[PDB]
Each structure stands twice: as structure tokens, then as C-alpha cells.
Amino acid sequence: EVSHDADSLCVVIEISKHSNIKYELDKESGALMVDRVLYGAQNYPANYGFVPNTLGSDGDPVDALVLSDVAFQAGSVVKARLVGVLNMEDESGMDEKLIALPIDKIDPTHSYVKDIDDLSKHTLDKIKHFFETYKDLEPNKWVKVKGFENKESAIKVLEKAIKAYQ
Amino acid sequence: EVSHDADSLCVVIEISKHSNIKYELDKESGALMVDRVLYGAQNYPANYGFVPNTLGSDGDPVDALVLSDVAFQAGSVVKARLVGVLNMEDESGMDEKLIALPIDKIDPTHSYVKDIDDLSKHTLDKIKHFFETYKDLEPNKWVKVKGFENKESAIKVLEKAIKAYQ
Amino acid sequence: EVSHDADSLCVVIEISKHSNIKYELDKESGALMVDRVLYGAQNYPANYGFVPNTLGSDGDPVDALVLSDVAFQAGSVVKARLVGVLNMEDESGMDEKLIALPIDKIDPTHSYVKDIDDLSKHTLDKIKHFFETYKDLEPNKWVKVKGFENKESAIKVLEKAIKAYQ
Amino acid sequence: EVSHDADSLCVVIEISKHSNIKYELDKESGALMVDRVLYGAQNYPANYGFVPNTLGSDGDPVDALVLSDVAFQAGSVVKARLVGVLNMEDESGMDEKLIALPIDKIDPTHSYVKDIDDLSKHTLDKIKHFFETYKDLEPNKWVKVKGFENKESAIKVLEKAIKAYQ
Amino acid sequence: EVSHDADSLCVVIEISKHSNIKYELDKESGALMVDRVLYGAQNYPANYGFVPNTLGSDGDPVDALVLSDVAFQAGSVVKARLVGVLNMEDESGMDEKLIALPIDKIDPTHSYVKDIDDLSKHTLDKIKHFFETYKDLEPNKWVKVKGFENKESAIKVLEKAIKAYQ
Amino acid sequence: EVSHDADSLCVVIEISKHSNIKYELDKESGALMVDRVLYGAQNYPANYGFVPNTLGSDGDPVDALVLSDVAFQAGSVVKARLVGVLNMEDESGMDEKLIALPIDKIDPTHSYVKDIDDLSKHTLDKIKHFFETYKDLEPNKWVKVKGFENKESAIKVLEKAIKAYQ
């Protein structure tokens, strides 16, 4: 039962916070595939996944970062709420990463975060710097981060991705 | 192949020992859902899960704690054996938590534990205190632990849950 | 070179965040003594230590919690800044726990926290609940938490402890 | 989509590197079963799994060790490449363990390893010693390791296992 | 203040439970030296250290294993109580390893263990097997474990070591 | 007893491999000070420390990276052997980082590495990229990595640092 509610959307976790291993769920066998081990001495600054039944810019489900103090197991599903979006350009084109938090029912730790600007400057910079450099060592690949936009913008991105899938 | 044998019953793990993240398996997609992150500075004193094809007091499969020195991955299934049951009352009514150990074929570490009284006083108190306080910070929720009962009592609870499902 | 500056005071770490092992530094050999392993399924919600050359209510150096996203090694020393104080009563009398953060030069993650009220409600409740229950299982011991006071109050506590030592 | 290419074969991970818990995937429910907790103070020297749609010496899919600096989650699937095979005899008969590495696209860390002899003497000895002793404490079970053979030999083992399944 | 009381003797921890890194304290600088990284895929089955101001069979302070569910930091000191001794022969001669537990004041988890026979068969076998094989891969070194003796025997070993130092 | 032998020099560890916390030993109290928590989502690619009784380019003891598969505890001392040196320029001037491995007596895992060129291209690139970016987020600070030089060059750096201290 995939929920597309901006304040309670399902996010399938593929990368656990702090891990340097990117997994990728196969949409036909449900197999969690080992996709990449970071080339650099880095670790994902947040849990990372995708929103089912959506179609993002690159033809794959729209991506979402789920910020939390804890790391969720790759393969699990967490109900989250949008607070913003991170825009970036890579060798394939534009890419968007929804910025979310688990719903308060799951973990109210950051219930005070209502919009992108409520997140600390330090956290935003860390996330931006990660995407800006995590593919440095990968040949023929690169990422140029543009910046973050608020929840209103993120909702537009989500709805556009939902409509595209339909 | 779900086994309901008291000395070798299947337990689907939803919470790994030492974790502060409670997962919950969805019975229709097999999706491991992130259900709750403990509000307090606590961690589950044992692996936690449910017995398939059973119907407990609250309408959900009967719960079981699988005591072990190691933490089993959420989503895995372990064959266990009963040694007792923990009775408690929450805001919804009575609740029972079967107390089990992996079968000796899997891990014989605590093969000497034949009944609830074989478990140390310290371990029992730690488990009781966990359930007695882990929901303190959650509004409108609470737990009043009654105490532990032996294997004979646990078997009755299991059989009643098995019959109810049938 | 022990600094007693409220915005840059030295804190000797004795307990690492997330650990259930309390160490205690011996002031004569510099030996890090294993003092206690929590009886319950809990873990320290922050790094914990004391301020050298001070004399608190119980005759020992004044205690300080150093809030951080990371865990500092027991035995290390971190320069911190005060943001508040936690008052509680135990079986021995009143006790105070200074609430601090590493100085921005060390980690600016929570540089936005200027006073106790800047900390999230969730974090404060978790800390309070920890002290309120972590000694439940210890016989003849108990803790009744009163509440938190601001940085202005914490500074008074520190200065009083510094003067007492002198 | 199971790939049987020697330089890109699918390996279903059942044991994560450094873990002392052996899981076993059930081929009918996809359930990850807890199979064994090592009796000794040991840990798997590599990620461990099997190659789907193959039939090894003991009637089960052929086993493969996936050497890596990182530990892959039990239940995930990694595309690997063969570099050798480890031959051993146990109480049931001969057994073979394919020796592999993730494909360079996933992690190029050990891209320099082209054949068994490229692996360090220390790593080979550690792996051999693990299988030679990890079942010492298990009654009625034992392992006598013969030695390692090169990639050419491993390919023969794989093809024979693939044909047997067909 | 080194205590030589059999029921409360000081043990300086040099190896943390589960670690594969053996440290060794230098008695002149207090420097914790990295001494050895296990050659095999193994990990210490208990915390390991020595009793200050004693002289064991090999001319060094008498060794002690401190059994616990938790791992103590290398370099820390824990007050323990004897429950037995493990006798073994290596390439240098006879060696004895005192078997201890933290005093109940520190952690009462295993307060029920009064003598060697109170420890589980599984734990004893795991410890014995560790010493029997952890030096297999080290050239010119080996260990032949004899067996465990009770607390009465351990006390004799300790007193003899204390007298020798004096 | 500080050894300055190129093939067995003492290295005081201040940063443990994989950690994002940089400690710094105080040369007057032996206090392990918390110096910095990385601003980015990164982790040290190796154990890091300094060689006692030496004087490097910046007036502090010469730095050394100790490559290993395991992480050594901050504050410990490991005997290492040189295999190269990493040259870089920061906002303060030129800086050199000796590249070393534990001596074979401690851990022979990488005994095959005799000179810088024996290290994998992947490991060298990861280390270089770490220093090139780990200070990106720190204001008024930066690092421009030049490249690695062999053991012969590293020895010159060490001897020059030893003479300078004398």
C-alpha cells in the first residue's frame, strides 16, 4: 500500500546512514543488489531510498534522503514527510533528491523540522559536500550540486513524478 | 513451512537485540516496515519477533522474545524453543510475550536453560524493566508488567494462539 | 592546562555516548577504572565526564554531559561550552549535571544551540528519563529528576564549584 | 536474471564478512533462516553465499566466498568474478568453495587480483585455517582442507555445477 | 592501590572482548603498545589482562581473563573475583590464565557463578578452543591446553604469583 | 624507548582508522585531547599518528599514516615500518605524511608491501582524495595534495625530522 502523501510517503531504503555500500532493489524479484562500494573514504550522510510508483528525471523512481539520527536497514520501508529537495547535475543530466524525515509516529526526534530552513547549516553543507565529492574518484562520472529548495518545491517534484508514472 | 512445535517453533525476527529500532513485517508484501524508534535511551534486551499463523490477545500473531548472546537480522527466521512467558498490561489490554531460545542445533550456548527459572535473575529483571519503561515517553501509552510464568504456561499460550488462528 | 571558562571549559570524558559502561578516572594514577555496567537495557544519551579542579555538591568534581552526535573515547578530554544544567535528587542528596557541547572549533554541528531552550524537547526528555530510570534496578539507589535550568544557572553552578575547590 | 558468467556471476550472500552467524536462504519462501551461530570464537573471513541455478557436489547450489574489504548484508546479491576455488573434505564428502571478488563496476579495490596467486599468503592461510577449525567444536562434524586451485579450475567447477542443474 | 584480594583483585585490561588486537602495557611509560593482530579469523572470547605487582610462570605479571557480556576498553582497570584457572603449555613452557568475573558491585550479571563449574560447558569449550588454535598460524609458536581448575586452585596460583613478586 | 629505525619506528596513534574524530596527544600531561570532528561525511582511511622526538615542517612531530586492515585505539603506540611519504600543501605551508605499515611481528598481513608502488592504486587514490577534501568545509583551510614518493624519500624526511629535533 504505497502512500504518496507528502506528509506520509513511503520510502524504500536502499542505503543505510553511515554505510559506504549502495544497494539497489530489483523491481521484479525484490532482490537487494549490491550496486556500489564508495571509492572514497566517505559514508552516506543519511538513509537513502526511492518512492515506489513514481518516475523521476532519469526514468527511475524519484530518490529521497531520509534524515534521522539512526540508520535504517537496507531493504526496509519507512513512512516519511517532505521538508525539501536537493538539486544537482551529473554526467547524465539533472537529478533531484527529495529531503525527508520519518513521520513523527515513527520517530519525533526532529518533529521541529517543518521546512528545509529548519535543518542546520552544518547538516545541509555536509549533505551537499557528500554529493559534490562522492563520485570524484569514479571515472567518467561527476556531480555539480546546485542547492536546496523548500518543501513547497519538493511537493511539486513529487507530484510531477507521481503523474509521470501514471 | 511454519513449525508450531513448542520445542522448535518458527519465529520471524522483527527487532534485533541491542537495537532501538522496531521493524514490523507487512503480511501481504513481505515488506519490513520501520515502525518505531525508541523515544528513550534504551535498546531491546533480546531479539524480538512473532510466530506465524497464530492469533494472540491483540489480534496479531503471538509475540516472542528470542534470548541469545547474538543479534539476529530483522527479517530473518529462527527456529526456537519455549522456556516461559512474560505477562503485561498496556493501554490496549493484556499482552503476552513468549520467552524463547534458539534451538540447540542453531546455537547451544544456553542449552542448559530448560525453564524460566534457569534464566538469571539479572536477565529477567532487565527484560521486565525494559517493557516497564520503554513506552514511558510515548504519550497515551504505558506498560504494567505482571511477571514471568514457566514453560508449561507458555505452551498453553502458544496452543491457544494456534487454535485461535485455525 | 585546565580551562574553567564557561564557553571553553575542559571536560574529562569518563563515559562514551551510547555505552552502557561507566568508567571512573582515579585522581592519583590516572587509571581509568571500570565502575559500573548498567543493570538495565539502557545506554548513556551523551558523553559524560567531569570538570577538573572543581568541587561539586557530593565532594567530587562537578559532572558534565557533553552532547554531540559522536561518541568520545573514555579517558579523552574535550573543550566544551555550557548551555544549561540538570538538577536531580538521589539517595545521597542533590546532584547537578552541567549540560554542554563541544566548542565550535572542535565540532560546530550544534553551534546554533546557545541556551538550554535551543535543545529539542525530545533530547531533553530522553536525558531526563535516562537519569530517572537508569538506577531503578540498583538496590538502595534512586534518582528523582527536578528539571533543567539555563546557561546563566549553569555558570553559577560552575563558579560555585570552582570557588569551593580553591 | 541469474548470470553464470565466470567474470560476472550472481552470488546470493548468506553470511556477512566478520559475522559469526550463518544464515541460509529458503528456496520456496525467500525466507532468510538463521542456520548456525559459530561454536567457537571465530568470524567468517569473507562474505559467503551461493550461485543460483547450480548444483554442487552436495546437492545444493555451489558455494562462493566473496572477498572484499566490506561486509555485504545477508540476503543481498552481488555480481562477482572468479579467481579460484578452495577444496576441502568434511564428514559428508568433498566440498568446493568458489573464491570470488565483486566485479570492478561494484568495487575495484582488488581489481589487481586476476588469479588465486594474486591474493596474499596471509589471506589464503586465514581462510584455510577458518574452514579447518570452525567446526572443531561441533560434534560429529569436521573439515580437512586440501588447498586452493586457480581460476581455470574454478571455472570448471562452476560449469560442471551449471550443467548438473540443467 | 592494587588489591590482591581473590574476591576483589585488580586486573589491567590489555585486550577487549571480541577484539582481534592484542595490546600490551609498558611498565615504565604506561604506554599501551599494539602487540599483535591475530593471524586467524578469530576474536578474544573474553576481556584479557594482568594482575599488577605479581610474578607469573613466565616472569611477567600473572594473566587473567575477565568474563563478561560487555567489552572493557584496553587500558582500563576492573576489580574482579576469581572463579578458576586455565592451564596450558606453549613453546616457552607452562602458562596459567586466571579465570575471573567483575565484582558484583561493577556488574552482577553473573553473580551466580561461584566456581569454574558454574560456567557453561559451551563457554569453557569456546575459551579452550581459542587458546588451542589462535596461534596455529604463527610460526614457531603453539599452545596445548590442559584444562580448567577450580577457584581453590586459582587462589593458589595467585598467592604464589604475589609471593614471587615480593 | 622511542625507536627511530625506518623499519621499526614508534608511532603514537591519535586517530583510529574509519573514525571521524581526530584526537591530539598533549605533550605534558599525556592527555588525549578531542581536537576535531570532521565537518564532512568522511572517515580516516588509515590509522594516524606521530613519531615521538622528531620535528616536522610545521614545528610538530612528523605525522605518519599506519595502513592496516584493523583500527588501532587512539592513544596506543605501534611499531611500524616506512614504505613511502605523501606530500601536500595546506594554508600553513608544506606538509608531509609518512606512509607506514605495522611491523610484520605485529601484523604480517601486508608484509608483501615493500615500497609505495606495492600499495594498490585504489588505496593511494582514496588516501589522496581524503586529504584533498576533508578540510573543504573548514573555513580558511584547504589542502592541495602533490603526490606520493617512495620509501627512500620517506627515510630522508624521517632523518631530517630526527636531526631537527636533536
Swiss-Prot record, chains A, B, C, D, E, F:
The source organism is: Helicobacter pylori (strain ATCC 700392 / 26695) (Campylobacter pylori)
Q: What class of enzyme is it?
A: hydrolase
UniProt entry keywords in alphabetical sequence: Cytoplasm, Hydrolase, Magnesium, Metal-binding
Which cofactors go with this protein? Mg(2+)
Residues bound to substrate are 22, 36, 48, 134
Which InterPro entries does UniProt cross-reference here? Pyrophosphatase, Pyrophosphatase_sf
GO biological process: any one?
phosphate-containing compound metabolic process
Role played: Catalyzes the hydrolysis of inorganic pyrophosphate (PPi) forming two phosphate ions.
* Subcellular localization, as worded in the UniProt entry: Cytoplasm
Would you name any one GO CC term? Answer: cytosol
* Binding residue positions for Mg(2+) 1: 58, 63, 95
Q: Record's PANTHER family?
A: INORGANIC PYROPHOSPHATASE
Listed CDD domains: pyrophosphatase
Name the family.
Belongs to the PPase family.
Q: Where does Mg(2+) 2 bind?
A: 63
Q: Which reaction does it catalyse?
A: diphosphate + H2O = 2 phosphate + H(+)
Assembly behavior: Homohexamer.
- Its recorded name reads Inorganic pyrophosphatase
Q: Which GO terms describe its molecular function?
A: inorganic diphosphate phosphatase activity; magnesium ion binding
**Enzyme Commission code(s) on record:** 3.6.1.1
Q: Specify where it is mainly localized.
A: cytoplasm
Q: Read off the HAMAP family from this record.
A: Inorganic_PPase (MF_00209)
Pfam families the record matches: Pyrophosphatase
Q: Species lineage, top-down?
A: Bacteria, Pseudomonadati, Campylobacterota, Epsilonproteobacteria, Campylobacterales
